[PDB]
Symmetry: D2
Subunit: 255 residues, 4 copies
């Protein structure tokens, strides 16, 4: 495949419906060696099964809230890999009331801090931590959503963080571009995942996109996965600082 | 003027070259009643002179880092005004190494938190706090910069925060829109202010914009001031969730 | 008013519900001297009444399809005015099948040519013809629609033309910017006008915008009129190459 | 490869330096069957060599200015293929004075018409003509430039046309989306091609992009070729109505 010999670290793989899971499957198919992260002592079993499922024994704990675990992540990976080719940032979180009902109702300084801490800062944080062992043609990938660019019901505080996330894609691309590293994001359409359950009336969003998107259909973690695999490969060596919509074209219309 | 009888609160007035100062002058000229905020026990004298200069006795301390001062601000304002017609958010801050040289060099979880805390969160924070005494045709205004949408040298972490700020403009517009309140931002071109001094090689930016902007000239706090006065007025009752460029058109070209 | 002593030529005034009519009323109120154009020998009477209604005797024929009438327009205006301060381009047209049903169904080389000829080319064309008699602080204004940036049902070929129109705003801004002339567009929300009648299911669009816009209301020619007067005035001397949304914020949300 | 069994028609292949040539090479590598078009009785020899070079005997004349040749193109192709999987629109033209010096100097109704006729209309025109023989998972691709979104020196009239082209990408995506057809564009960075020679001071642009792009390097027809191959493949089945930048990230920065 077009990822033969590429070593890729994936975050955010929580279940077999996770976006990170879709990307992992596509990357393995295209011939990459994978490494995974998990959050919390408990999930170690579930993620190891997933890793083994993709032919990997490399799993590392990393709660992006903790600077310690982040530095430890790449110190540990370095004992197995001396060169990192790909990094998949598929991580997001906000207190649930900050993504429910009215934007102001759920707004608190703490909710704001957490949402941006975990959903935005973590990307460039991981990048900075990985820099020393990044190959010269390395590719960094993150996941964003249309809510960053336009106001979407219930998305609220998460929207602000995503806007920051996308801005970081650009500033990262400039900082790491000299070395030859590319940084991109995929703005994915709605997908029924674990995290998606916390967004109020997510079903309304799925129905609406299926009805109004140009392709009249929702996207899959396979379609997002393939797009991700492409951006991580040398096929996209001309692409950086890009926010690529994988949403059946929904962003481009007025529903 | 087109602001006769409007009561407007302005933050960020620090010196006579401040953007907030430009907006203040324009609003007064168009007939508004002004109120001001200052940071730190010390600046009370300097801001009181400015307030008097605009025919106001209303100055209140407000460090947007402190929830207490924010709640106290509108509690105090309520003893003078029972109705707030306008709110000007002209506030920004990041640790200086976070806006110097390389994006990653200046990136730390703390620098990130501070920048977003003060430059982004504070806007919707003030909005939420002012909501109870906001008129039905009230208008909220904030200041942003091209660095949110494109990667600008040295702007770094501030770019991420501004992106979040612009996103909050949209989500605020939806939340307060029902009541009839409008929320907008002005994306101002570079202006030699106090804060601007902290941006490395700011002079290079001024020269470049003057040379490459369609109008071949930099903007003034009077031009930003007038635009702000417009957006705060009923003349712009059809405008909300808008990021208006006041930058001599620089954003629309490739220099 | 903030347009005292400004001489402004308005195209597109067809009925008292026209956007151009809204702009004219606002401009007169703020103290401008107005001049008007009409299409076809017949409408001369109706437009002269309107002109008189705004205290003007200056009406000139100008079918923007004809280079002759365009050059003649400013030759004639020059006999009354030696200096033009403002130009309002409120003109649009496409064959009706090109803005009905399916995009491809209504697509023909001729329909394409006409739509772009009248709706896009005419703006920079009028600009070029007016250049010799334009003041140094002159302001040019055109009207666009969200359909240029996103696909809107039935707008079809008109969307392509508007996209070109908005692009011309930018290139015009660069070309005339040196002299000191500003070029802008207002992206207006849906308004029940004569032309609007030709857009299939225009009523559905009005209802949708009223329901989903942040301000939960449609815009008026008065609100667009005021925005236009602002952009035409020195109050907006810092603004050029801008496409300003006057649509109750509709563009910024997902409905 | 990921294009095994796909039948793709390519326009715009003029020299081994053409963008279409880069795309052709990448598609063949990934396993597609190719067909080519040429303009003018004369170039038939040169294009047949190129086609043979990619293992194809299918070349058809098509001057997109002529409705006749366009209809004849797909009538002829239908005798060899009963199903078209891909269409590559790599065509552009404007009278040379329309892309030299000042925007207004080169502006004439005729120059405007031609530029939009050949560079914008031709895309949806070809699409409509190909519709009857398009497969349900077909993918259409066109080439655009940053000049559509921002004012670039000398690009002038071409910028307007590209803006229209990108708008057509969106309306096309909606019209053909129901059937399952995807429509996308690649916004390519500057590449030294035949057409590029007609843009005044093209060398200045190449140097500037190489110096200021995040990757500090210009792009190749191979990099654009790969991106194009991706968008034409099922790997990108989640992507439509997208304008993908392949420009080393240049668009995302301020140089
Ligand atoms: N699911 C969708 O419809 C959709 C659409 C667009 C964008 N996205 C974005 O895609 C990304 C991945 O979400 P998903 O939908 O694949 O979901 P998912 O819920 O299956 O996984 C989200 C992951 O985030 C991780 N995470 C949360 N807080 C963390 C922390 N403090 N430290 C480390 N990891 C943490 C979880 O462990 C989990 O693996 C998120 O940024 C989400 O906003 C999702
Ligand atoms: N100066 C420019 O060229 C320029 C360009 C675009 C945008 N902006 C934005 O305009 C706004 C005004 O900045 P300016 O350049 O006019 O500068 P200025 O330095 O005169 O004012 C900035 C203000 O921020 C205030 N501030 C900082 N930390 C604060 C805190 N914790 N609590 C409350 N207030 C705090 C300061 O007291 C000061 O009054 C900022 O948001 C800035 O990003 C400025
Ligand atoms: N009404 C809306 O909802 C809306 C929304 C967005 C944009 N617009 C834009 O507003 C502008 C004016 O539309 P309106 O709604 O005020 O309409 P209106 O229907 O009352 O007027 C249309 C105008 O087209 C002009 N016109 C047509 N062919 C012409 C030609 N060959 N030469 C000169 N003038 C010609 C006429 O003078 C007429 O006044 C158009 O560019 C339209 O696209 C309208
Ligand atoms: N080369 C660049 O730097 C660059 C960058 C971005 C976008 N583009 C776009 O890419 C496309 C191809 O440009 P290129 O640089 O690969 O160039 P190229 O000059 O080698 O090819 C341009 C093609 O236009 C075609 N063409 C011209 N007039 C035509 C007509 N009347 N009918 C049909 N076809 C006609 C010719 O077949 C020619 O091969 C154009 O749309 C151009 O705007 C080019
Ligand atoms: O960004 C998302 C967008 C959609 Cl449409 C669905 C799920 C998303 O992902 C999240 C949603 C809420 C929280 Cl709290 C965390 C995450 Cl990761
Ligand atoms: O945002 C700005 C943009 C420009 Cl071009 C110039 C000055 C700006 O204002 C600031 C810059 C840096 C910091 Cl830390 C704080 C502020 Cl208020
Ligand atoms: O552009 C418009 C957009 C809207 Cl929502 C309503 C009216 C518009 O104006 C026109 C619409 C169609 C044609 Cl043929 C001509 C014109 Cl002037
Ligand atoms: O769009 C382009 C952009 C660049 Cl940077 C270089 C070449 C381009 O393509 C053209 C430019 C001018 C003409 Cl007349 C024809 C074509 Cl095909």
């Amino acid at each position: 495949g077009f990822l033969d010999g590429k070593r890729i670290l994936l975050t955010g793989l929580l279940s077999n419906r996770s976006i990170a899971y879709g990307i992992a499957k596509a990357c393995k198919r295209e011939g990459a060696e994978l490494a995974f992260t998990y959050v919390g002592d408990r999930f170690k079993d579930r993620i190891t099964e997933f890793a083994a499922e993709f032919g990997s024994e490399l799993v590392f704990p990393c709660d992006v809230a903790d600077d310690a675990q982040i530095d430890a992540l790449f110190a540990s990976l370095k004992t197995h890999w001396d060169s990192l080719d790909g990094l998949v940032h598929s991580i997001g979180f906000a207190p649930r009331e900050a993504i429910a009902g009215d934007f102001l109702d759920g707004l608190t300084r703490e909710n704001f801090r957490i949402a941006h801490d975990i959903s935005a800062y973590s990307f460039p944080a991981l990048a900075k931590a990985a820099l020393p062992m990044l190959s010269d043609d390395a590719s960094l990938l993150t996941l964003s959503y249309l809510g960053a660019e336009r106001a979407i019901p219930n998305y609220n505080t998460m929207g602000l963080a995503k806007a920051a996330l996308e801005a970081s894609v650009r500033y990262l691309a400039v900082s790491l571009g000299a070395k030859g590293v590319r940084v991109n994001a995929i703005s994915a359409g709605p997908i029924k995942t674990l995290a998606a359950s916390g967004i109020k009336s997510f079903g309304k969003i799925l129905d609406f996109v299926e009805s109004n998107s140009p392709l009249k259909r929702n996207v899959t973690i396979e379609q997002v996965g393939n797009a991700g695999a492409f951006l991580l490969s040398d096929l996209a060596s001309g692409v950086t600082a890009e926010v690529m919509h994988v949403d059946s074209g929904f962003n481009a219309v007025v529903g």
